Amino acid sequence: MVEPQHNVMQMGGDFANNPNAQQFIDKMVNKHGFDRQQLQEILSQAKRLDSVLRLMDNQGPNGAWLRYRKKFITPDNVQNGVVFWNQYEDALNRAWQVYGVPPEIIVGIIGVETRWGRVMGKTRILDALATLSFNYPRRAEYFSGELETFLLMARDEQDDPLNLKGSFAGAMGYGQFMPSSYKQYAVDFSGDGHINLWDPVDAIGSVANYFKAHGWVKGDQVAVMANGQAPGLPNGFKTKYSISQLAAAGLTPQQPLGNHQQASLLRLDVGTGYQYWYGLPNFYTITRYNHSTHYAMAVWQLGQAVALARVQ
């Protein structure tokens, strides 16, 4: 009946003779009460994906912004965004009330991430995380922490760890949450007692919670386009200047900046020239999801495009 298999100490598969896999198993048994044999059976089936390693290694004016933008803001995406918004309007309104994060932001995030569930990833999370944890020295510690959290998540939500699929980095569901984000920010917004990253209602609430946790200020402006050019100043979502310094550089805000006394200097390559913007705190909050000016600007404008298409 019961087979302890204490004598079965060596696993097969792609990670069969991997010291890192061995230490990881020891950590899981010692720290979380995992059964060594059960974990070896799971990891023996895990695959080392060289494509995952290659991708992790892989990461004017000529119209840069324009090319990036058109990958996301298209008639098909805006129309599908409208459908998702209307279909999950209650969840979106509830997220606005509970977290102060507006529907266009959540709709924009889920649209840029997975096109509202159409592209959620085809890689087994276990394969990606074991590959990155056991055969990638550069970020081995970070991904080992993710694999740990993933296996704990699977155990708790009662999922077979080998059934879940996602990105080459192990990101999951509608919002493409990493295991650590599931742990720190995912909420059971649907109220069934389970946190499911593949349930659009849960994902909606989880994205909203993530935003509020990262400082989203309800009702505050995201960014305001500037009149003028500021070629002498370094730009990017990480920059920071007082409104006074930006004015001295030849900029004026197209909309009143309220009480904001500083801002980041954003610059978009619109082909014919450069379009400068005053980046406000909420814009930076969007970059917390993906450290990129283009990313955050596309999330915001896609959400705006859907909001408008809904009014029609």
Ligand SMILES: [Ca+2]
């Ligand atoms: Ca749920």
